């Protein structure tokens, strides 16, 4: 039902072609972005406080 | 504790556990292949080979076994029709219990490699530790891969001791197991031909011999060693994943666009044969030909033979299926049974008419009939209310020749619209959808199968690639960074990045 | 104190790469608006 | 010779000017000639 | 704890010896480049032959060549 | 840690800017000092870590350090000669340049 | 070429693979390592002490060079006896056993 | 014999190695010049 | 350092506005040479030959609906090099022909494989975790799976997509109204790794700015910073209770955090991209086989799938003529699919 | 700090900044300006006219078949 | 002629640029 809505909508009011739809397409594709980079970024900088056989999140 | 993640980390510095896992691995993948081809052997339908081939019913491995020459079964029927003479012990049943046997063989070395892992063999002279020296470790093993693949493409393909390989036809009517002899020339990168084949496993053999033994006698460079990490394991399994990915990636494109290596009378058309008429073509050539010869339409389309006709269909089509459509196409289309005979459709003043053919991209295609020269003259209507091509209008009639239905007529408008809604598949066929309950959708061949299942593991194996070699190269840091990590993180502080001998601007 | 800085350097030749073909297309675009059909 | 800066400030005035004039002659470029539909 | 003799194990123990010994300096990175470089050359010359980006007079690449 | 001074932040007229650059105010220190909606101070001011880690963010991160720039620049060395030199050259641009989109254009 | 030159080798030091360790490094160099070649062992399967050195040398090119003489005396008079080239007398000798 | 697409594959292939030597004959002039005193 | 690598390694890797390193051979000549054709495609060359369109400034078209097409289904997947056998060195038939978008594609691999690698170098240098790099790997496998695998597993370039806006959403609308790729599973975890991803970053950007310490006397929080301080500078034990009180579970390990956020974006774009390799092979998962004999023996049983399905036939029969012009299609008006007075 | 480059708000500040690039820019607009409308954008990268989208010869959309006569046929579709 | 016409124009601006700079350029080079 809900891709049923989708298209519909596309037939009769071009919501691809509206800004504002680009705009929360590019929200979402920004906040994935920056959501990984985040993430990785601060996977990336953890200061040792365990071993190797076991998870950081344990540190 | 251990993460569920890392279980398998404990015998990355054990070299007899390590072999003891290796063994495991081997004995399950042995154990599959001869209990898949048993499960083959017992639902396999030999009786027709023509309108009801292997990879009509799903078949998996028993291709990949006749390819290299295995044709004979101790059930006394042959691949090819006849009867077996004399099997011997090398069928296909003969194959799966060989390769039962060696997984349980491997399973019993697995156990005692497992048990007995102390051997001194595995210790390093110098400092009594456990260590490989994985430089001349590959160099063993090139060499006697450059042996292997050298023996393969000088006794088994060329027949001098083997069988030799799968060689047919470019139609794919008549091919048998023959040995092939060697192709030197520009004519050897023909993916086309098995020539290429031997001329390749016997140079390449030749090479990795040389190369293994190079391998052994030159010891590794300092740079390179420090550089690529020598001293660890992950790095070669980082570059074992990145070349098992390319030869998936390349046997994933071979099978798809077919090759020599991959012959359609035991994997199916490819999609390309339909989109472009590769059989339509000779078809219609040969049937030109025997039109030159002075005889009649009927004699004419009574000598194309029912395997050619049925290479020309939609239905045999690899890129016509589903996803989570299980199962053979017999399971969706039905076990064909005779060719119908060529449908032509004539218009009421004696013009030929022609449907057109429905692209590999729909799911569902209009009904319209072409002339010769390309222009609409009628169609089946989705709007009756005002039709100016309706074929009551036109009033087109339909005519067999050759097959069942040769020599009949119809004019019946609902019958002409049925078989101009048949004839958009090709061929039109006679199908058994009752001893299957078949569904009546469309499914894929072994060679879509093999493409799809291969594409998503080169995938999948790219990412292994990308992350061993990082663990291999960032493994100082596996744990974390340095307490205090400022200094050499500051913005200007030294010439060079991370070097501290050049503390400047 | 004296600060003395390189005029050319990589980053000058990275701003300017995209700098210059970036002009010379804004110049082209500004004069397509003004043909008529 | 000539001693004295440019301020800051004034530089982005006029930059911002200049472009809010290009993204104005586009837009009216958009409503007349190519692709204006009439 | 020395390990596990066996007649195996002493008869293969030469081939696990020399576990650090490395070539000083660079070694022989310059011959791998080139042969790197020619295994490259060939790979782009088979790409194209199948591509068909390069024509050859005796190569039909097609079906047909299995005549 | 962190030494205020050397952080090239002392090349600047206002005296307010120069405050709000270092991330430092002396007003919001005082304990009677109160902001626009009424909110009474607790004396940390603009950071409450700023003796133990030296400044704040602002004063550990400039960019803009009026201290680092070319003491050339300031001056045009080719004076008023260079700089009717660049007026007669523009004019005579200015004017080649209309005059070829003129010409080029269909009038 | 110098194949025969003295080798002169370096010894790197085993790579940490712990597992119960916080920090595991790679392997530096130990020091500087130069064998003693041309010694032989009871190994059976390496019973040289180095592959590059000239006594080793020397016994494979007395191998070859024997093995090369007998061969082209007995491709000549082979070819001179039976008629058929030496290339094409393995082939026929393969088909059917003779001499 | 060759045909043209044959010669033109031959001289890609040099192009492109003459852009690679280009680049690294680049690099190393650059690095020689401006180098790091220890 | 006296070797030719050593002098060679010094000034690359040297500390820069832009770093260089010895992956910026492979990365800045391509990404420079992509971003120009893409942007030379835009602005000057045409579509009128290959596609029978208009996709650049000079024809009349904005930012929106130009576009680099690409080739012709007779050129099959040719690579389409200037010296090829089409093109035989002539760039303005090159361009005509549309061997910018092989151009701008093959280059456009290198740089992202050159991006990778340049932030392994970059991460080995300041002797971090290359999780940065790793996180990579869902992009690069999303562009390889779709301008890639897809266009090879197909007739040939001609159904790739184009580099631009409008005909970006010429090749979703494709794709839904072919393969029913909305009722594919791999794209329904890639659309919820999306959205959790989404979800992740807002609710952590919100819950952080929300559980500030007290560093400071001015309503501005964002001057009660110091990067080098060591306490932290939200209370973790405050957002865990809020949100364990209003949604039930909360978070209570910083490091898992932030490898969940990492996890969920990466996760999502793999399923996603395995999804299409397997549409490569029209593998799609179109049809519910028991929903439609139901429906084909019961004239009364309808449901939202048959909907969509009568929708996909409708856009396949009413794109199909100009989408694909070598298929020639001449379809009367009274053969394509219609509804009652619309 | 500073990697050792000039700082851009001390360049962007300068009068020999504004001096140098008070020609360089205008004149990059002008050569952009000059190469669209005297013709060079057409012939150069081989897009129609808006008279040459429709030849006397066809009246339809272009169609290239060939794909090792493509250049050829690219050539006879372009004649005008 | 057309590609000669913005060649010629472009000539000035090397030459204004080449007058403006060469003294500090120099001065680096060096
Ligand atoms: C997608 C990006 C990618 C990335 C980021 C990495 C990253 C890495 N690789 Mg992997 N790899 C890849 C793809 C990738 N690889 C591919 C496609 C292969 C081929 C199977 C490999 C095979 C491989 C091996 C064999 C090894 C690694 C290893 C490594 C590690 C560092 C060494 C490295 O830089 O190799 C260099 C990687 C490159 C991709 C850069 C080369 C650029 C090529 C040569 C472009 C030249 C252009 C081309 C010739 C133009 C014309 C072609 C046209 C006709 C089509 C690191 C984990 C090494 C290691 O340390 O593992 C532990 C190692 O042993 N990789
Ligand atoms: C920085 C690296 C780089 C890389 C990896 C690529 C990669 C690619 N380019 Mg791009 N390109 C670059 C920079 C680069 N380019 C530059 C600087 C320019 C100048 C503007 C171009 C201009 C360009 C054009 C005009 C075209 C491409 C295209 C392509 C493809 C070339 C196919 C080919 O057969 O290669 C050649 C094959 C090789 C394997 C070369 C390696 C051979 C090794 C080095 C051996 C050397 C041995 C030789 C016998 C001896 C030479 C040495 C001696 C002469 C000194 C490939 C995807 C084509 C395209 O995209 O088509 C759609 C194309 O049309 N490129
Ligand atoms: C060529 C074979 C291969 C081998 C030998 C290894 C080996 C290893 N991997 Mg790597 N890896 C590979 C390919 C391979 N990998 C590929 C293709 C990928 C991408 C998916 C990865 C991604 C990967 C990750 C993300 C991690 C490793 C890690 C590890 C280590 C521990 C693994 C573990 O304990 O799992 C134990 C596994 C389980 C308890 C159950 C997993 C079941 C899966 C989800 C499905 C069931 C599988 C099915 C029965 C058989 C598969 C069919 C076959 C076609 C693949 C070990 C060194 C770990 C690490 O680095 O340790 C430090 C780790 O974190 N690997
Ligand atoms: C152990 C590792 C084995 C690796 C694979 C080896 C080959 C397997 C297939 C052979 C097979 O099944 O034969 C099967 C055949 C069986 O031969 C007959 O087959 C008929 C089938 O209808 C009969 O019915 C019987 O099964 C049988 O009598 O074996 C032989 O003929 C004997 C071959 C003996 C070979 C011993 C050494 C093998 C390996 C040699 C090294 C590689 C090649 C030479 C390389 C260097 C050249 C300078
Ligand atoms: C053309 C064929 C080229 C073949 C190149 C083979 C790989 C050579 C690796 C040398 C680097 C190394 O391992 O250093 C090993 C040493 C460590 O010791 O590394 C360093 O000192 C720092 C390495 C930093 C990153 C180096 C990347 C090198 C990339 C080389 C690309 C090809 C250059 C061709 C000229
Ligand atoms: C532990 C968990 C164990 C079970 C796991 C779940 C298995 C789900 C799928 C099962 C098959 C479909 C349902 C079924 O029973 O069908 C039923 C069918 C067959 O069942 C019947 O078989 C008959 C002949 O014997 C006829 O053909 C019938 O038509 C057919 O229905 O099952 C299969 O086809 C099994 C196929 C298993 C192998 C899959 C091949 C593709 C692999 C792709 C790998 C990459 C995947 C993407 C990347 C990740
Ligand atoms: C999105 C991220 C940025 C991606 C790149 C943007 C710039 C690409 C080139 C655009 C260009 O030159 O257009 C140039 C075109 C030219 O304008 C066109 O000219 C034609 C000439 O024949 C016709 O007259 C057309 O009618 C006319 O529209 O301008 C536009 O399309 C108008 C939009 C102006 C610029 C919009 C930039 C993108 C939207 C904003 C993004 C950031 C939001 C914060
Ligand atoms: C992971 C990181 C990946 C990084 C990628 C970096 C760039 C990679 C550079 C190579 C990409 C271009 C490859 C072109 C292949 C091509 O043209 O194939 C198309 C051609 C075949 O050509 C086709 O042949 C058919 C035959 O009936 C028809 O005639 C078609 O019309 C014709 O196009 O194949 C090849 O050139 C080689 C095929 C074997 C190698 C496969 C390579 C990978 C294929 C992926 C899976 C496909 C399914
Ligand atoms: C009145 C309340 C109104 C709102 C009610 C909300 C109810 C939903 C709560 C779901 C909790 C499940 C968490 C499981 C796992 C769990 O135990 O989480 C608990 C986990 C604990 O984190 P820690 O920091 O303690 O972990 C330490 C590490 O060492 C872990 O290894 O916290 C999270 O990961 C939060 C993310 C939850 C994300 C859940 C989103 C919703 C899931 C999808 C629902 C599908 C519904 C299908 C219906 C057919
Ligand atoms: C003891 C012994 C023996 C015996 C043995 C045996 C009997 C064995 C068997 C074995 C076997 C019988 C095995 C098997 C195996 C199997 C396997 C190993 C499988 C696997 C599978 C999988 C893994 C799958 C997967 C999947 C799925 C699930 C679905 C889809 C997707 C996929 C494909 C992924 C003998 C007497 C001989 C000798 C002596 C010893
Ligand atoms: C700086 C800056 C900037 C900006 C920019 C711009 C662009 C601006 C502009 C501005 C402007 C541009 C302004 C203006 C204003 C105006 C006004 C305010 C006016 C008023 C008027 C009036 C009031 C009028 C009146 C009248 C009437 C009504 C009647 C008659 C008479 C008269 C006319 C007088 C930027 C963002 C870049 C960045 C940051 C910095
Ligand atoms: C093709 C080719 C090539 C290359 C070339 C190149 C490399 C080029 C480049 C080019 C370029 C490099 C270009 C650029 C352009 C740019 C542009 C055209 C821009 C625009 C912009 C805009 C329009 C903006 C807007 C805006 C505003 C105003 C506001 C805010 C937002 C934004 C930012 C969006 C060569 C010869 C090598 C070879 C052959 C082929
Ligand atoms: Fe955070």
């Given at each position: 039902g809900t891709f049923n809505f989708m298209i519909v909508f596309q037939a009769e009011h071009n919501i691809l072609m509206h800004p504002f739809h680009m705009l929360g397409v590019a929200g979402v594709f920004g906040g994935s972005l920056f959501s990984a980079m985040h993430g990785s970024l601060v996977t990336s900088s953890l200061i040792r406080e365990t071993t190797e056989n076991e998870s950081a999140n344990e540190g | 504790g251990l993460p569920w993640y890392r279980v398998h980390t404990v015998v990355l510095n054990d070299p007899?556990?390590?072999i003891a896992v290796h063994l495991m691995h081997t004995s399950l993948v042995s154990g599959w292949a001869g209990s898949m081809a048993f499960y083959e052997l017992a639902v396999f339908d030999p009786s027709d080979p023509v309108l009801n081939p292997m990879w009509r019913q799903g078949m998996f491995v028993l291709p990949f076994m006749t390819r290299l020459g295995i044709t004979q079964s101790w059930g006394g029927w042959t691949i090819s029709g006849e009867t077996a003479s004399n099997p011997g012990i090398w069928s296909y049943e003969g194959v799966a219990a060989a390769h039962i046997i060696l997984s349980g063989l491997l399973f019993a070395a697995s156990i005692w490699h497992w048990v007995y892992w102390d051997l001194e063999l595995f210790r390093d002279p110098r400092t009594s530790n456990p260590a490989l020296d994985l430089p001349k470790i590959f160099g063993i093993h090139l060499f006697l891969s450059g042996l292997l693949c050298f023996g393969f493409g000088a006794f088994h393909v060329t027949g001098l001791f083997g069988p030799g390989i799968w060689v047919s036809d470019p139609y794919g009517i008549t091919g048998t197991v023959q040995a092939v002899a060697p192709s030197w020339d520009?004519?050897?990168?023909?993916?086309?031909?098995?020539?290429?084949?031997?001329?390749?496993?016997?140079?390449?053999?030749?090479?990795?011999?040389?190369?293994?033994?190079?391998?052994?006698?030159?010891?590794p460079p300092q740079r390179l060693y420090n550089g690529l990490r020598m001293g660890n394991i992950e790095?070669?399994?980082?570059?074992?994943?990145?070349?098992?990915?390319?030869?998936?990636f390349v046997v994933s494109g071979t099978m798809w666009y077919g090759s020599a290596a991959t012959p359609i009378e035991l994997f199916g058309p490819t999609r390309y044969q339909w989109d472009l008429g590769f059989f339509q073509q000779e078809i219609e050539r040969r049937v030109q030909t025997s039109l030159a010869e002075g005889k009649s339409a009927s004699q004419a389309w009574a000598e194309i033979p029912e395997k050619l006709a049925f290479y020309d269909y939609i239905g045999n089509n690899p890129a016509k299926g589903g996803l989570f459509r299980a199962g053979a196409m017999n399971s969706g289309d039905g076990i064909a049974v005779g060719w119908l005979g060529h449908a032509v459709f004539k218009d009421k003043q004696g013009n030929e008419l022609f449907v057109r053919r429905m692209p590999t991209f729909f799911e569902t295609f209009p009904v319209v009939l072409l002339d010769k020269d390309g222009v609409v003259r009628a169609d089946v209507p989705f709007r009756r209310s005002e039709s100016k091509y309706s074929i009551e209008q036109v009033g087109v009639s339909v005519?067999?020749?050759?097959?069942?239905?040769?020599?009949?007529?119809?004019?019946?408008?609902?019958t002409v619209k049925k078989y101009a809604r048949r004839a958009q598949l090709g061929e039109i066929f006679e199908f058994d959808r009752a001893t299957l309950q078949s569904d009546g959708v469309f499914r894929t061949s072994p060679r879509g199968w093999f493409t799809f299942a291969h594409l998503c593991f080169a995938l999948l194996f790219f990412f292994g690639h990308i992350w061993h070699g990082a663990r291999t190269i960032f493994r100082d840091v596996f744990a974390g960074i340095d307490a205090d990590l400022d200094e050499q993180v500051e913005f200007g502080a030294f010439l060079k990045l991370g070097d501290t001998s050049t503390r400047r601007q | 104190k004296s600060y003395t800085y390189p005029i050319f350097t990589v980053r000058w030749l990275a701003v300017h790469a995209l700098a210059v073909p970036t002009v010379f297309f804004l110049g082209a675009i500004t004069a397509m608006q003004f043909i008529q059909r | 010779g000539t001693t004295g800066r440019i301020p800051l400030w004034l530089v982005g005035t006029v930059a911002g000017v200049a472009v809010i004039a290009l993204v104005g002659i586009f837009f009216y470029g958009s409503y007349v000639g190519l692709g204006s539909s009439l | 704890d020395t390990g596990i003799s066996t007649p195996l194990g002493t008869l293969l123990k030469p081939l696990n010896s020399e576990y650090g010994k490395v070539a000083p300096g660079w070694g022989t990175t310059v011959l791998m480049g080139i042969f790197m470089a020619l295994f490259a050359v060939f790979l782009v010359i088979i790409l194209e032959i199948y591509n068909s980006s390069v024509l050859l007079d005796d190569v039909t690449m097609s079906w047909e060549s299995l005549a | 840690k962190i030494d205020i001074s050397k952080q090239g932040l002392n090349s600047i007229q206002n005296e307010t800017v120069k405050?709000?650059?270092?991330?430092?105010?002396?007003?919001?220190?005082?304990?009677?000092?109160?902001?626009?909606?009424?909110?009474?101070?607790?004396?940390?001011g603009v950071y409450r870590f700023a003796n133990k880690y030296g400044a704040n963010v602002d004063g550990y991160s400039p960019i803009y350090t009026p201290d680092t720039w070319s003491e050339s620049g300031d001056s045009y060395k080719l004076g008023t000669k260079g700089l009717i030199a660049w007026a007669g050259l523009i004019v005579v641009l200015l004017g080649v340049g209309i005059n070829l989109v003129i010409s080029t254009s269909a009038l | 070429l110098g194949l025969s030159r003295p080798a002169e080798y370096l010894q790197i030091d085993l790579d940490e693979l712990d597992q119960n360790a916080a920090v595991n490094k790679a392997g530096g160099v130990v020091g500087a390592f130069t064998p003693v070649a041309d010694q032989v062992s009871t190994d059976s399967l390496a019973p040289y002490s180095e592959v590059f050195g000239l006594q080793r040398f020397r016994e494979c090119e007395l191998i070859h060079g024997r093995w090369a003489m007998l061969a082209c005396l007995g491709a000549l008079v082979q070819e001179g006896v039976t008629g058929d080239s030496w290339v094409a007398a393995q082939t026929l000798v393969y088909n059917q056993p003779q001499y | 014999a060759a045909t043209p697409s044959l010669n033109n594959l031959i001289g890609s292939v040099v192009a492109g190695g003459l852009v690679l030597a280009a680049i690294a004959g680049a690099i190393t002039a650059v690095s020689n010049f401006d180098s790091i005193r220890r | 350092k006296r070797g030719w690598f050593d002098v060679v390694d010094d000034w690359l890797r040297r500390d820069r506005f832009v770093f260089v390193g010895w992956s910026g051979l492979l990365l800045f000549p391509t990404a420079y040479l992509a971003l120009g054709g893409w942007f030379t495609g835009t602005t000057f060359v045409t579509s009128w030959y290959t596609h029978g369109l208009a996709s650049s400034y000079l024809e009349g078209c904005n930012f929106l609906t130009a576009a680099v097409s690409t080739p012709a289904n007779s050129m099959g997947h040719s690579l389409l090099f200037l010296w090829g056998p089409e093109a035989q060195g002539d760039f303005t038939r090159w361009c005509q022909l549309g061997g910018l978008w092989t151009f701008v594609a093959l280059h456009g691999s290198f740089s992202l494989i050159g991006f990778m690698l340049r932030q392994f170098e970059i991460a080995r240098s300041v002797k971090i975790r290359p999780y940065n790099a790793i996180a990579f790997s869902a992009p690069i496998s999303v562009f390889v799976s779709v301008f890639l695998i897809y266009p090879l597993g197909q007739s040939g370039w001609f159904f790739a997509p184009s580099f631009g806006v409008a005909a970006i959403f010429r090749f979703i609308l494709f794709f839904q109204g072919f393969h029913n790729w909305?009722?594919?599973?791999?794209?329904?975890?890639?659309?919820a790794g999306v959205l959790g991803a989404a979800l992740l970053c807002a609710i952590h950007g919100a819950?952080?700015?929300?559980?500030?310490?007290?560093?400071?006397?001015?309503?501005?929080?964002?001057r009660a910073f110091n990067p080098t301080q060591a306490e932290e500078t939200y209370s973790m034990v405050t957002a865990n209770r809020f949100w364990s009180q209003i949604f039930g579970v909360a978070f209570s390990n910083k490091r898992w955090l932030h490898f969940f956020m990492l996890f969920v974006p990466v996760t999502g774009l793999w399923m996603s991209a395995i999804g299409v390799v397997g549409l490569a092979l029209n593998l799609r998962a179109y049809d519910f086989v028991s929903q439609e004999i139901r429906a084909a023996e019961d004239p009364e049983f309808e449901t939202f799938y048959t909907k969509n399905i009568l929708l996909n036939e409708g856009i396949r029969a009413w794109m199909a003529a100009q989408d694909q012009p070598h298929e020639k299609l001449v379809f009367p008006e009274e053969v394509l699919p219609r509804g009652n007075a619309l | 700090g500073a990697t050792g480059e000039r700082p851009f708000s001390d360049i962007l500040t300068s009068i020999r900044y504004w001096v140098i690039h008070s020609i360089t820019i205008p004149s990059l607009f002008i050569a952009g300006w000059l190469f669209v409308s005297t013709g060079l954008a057409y012939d150069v990268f081989g897009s129609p006219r808006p008279n040459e989208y429709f030849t006397e010869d066809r009246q339809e959309t272009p169609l290239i078949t060939d794909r090792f006569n493509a250049l050829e046929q690219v050539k006879k579709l372009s004649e005008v | 002629n057309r590609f000669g016409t913005i060649?010629?124009?472009?000539?000035?601006?090397?030459?204004?640029?080449?007058?403006?700079?060469?003294?500090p350029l120099q001065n680096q080079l060096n």
């Open positions: - | 007899g556990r390590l520009a004519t050897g990168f023909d993916p086309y031909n098995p020539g290429g084949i031997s001329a390749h496993h016997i140079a390449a053999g030749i090479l990795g011999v040389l190369a293994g033994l190079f391998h052994l006698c030159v010891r790095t070669v399994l980082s570059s074992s994943i990145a070349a098992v990915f390319w030869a998936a005519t067999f020749y050759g097959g069942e239905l040769d020599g009949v007529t119809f004019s019946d408008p609902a | - | - | - | 405050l709000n650059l270092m991330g430092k105010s002396k007003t919001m220190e005082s304990k009677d000092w109160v902001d626009p909606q009424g909110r009474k101070g607790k004396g940390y | - | - | 909305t009722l594919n599973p791999f794209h329904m975890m890639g659309v819950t952080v700015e929300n559980t500030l310490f007290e560093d400071g006397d001015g309503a501005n929080t964002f | - | 060649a010629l124009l472009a000539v000035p601006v090397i030459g204004w640029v080449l007058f403006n700079i060469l003294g």
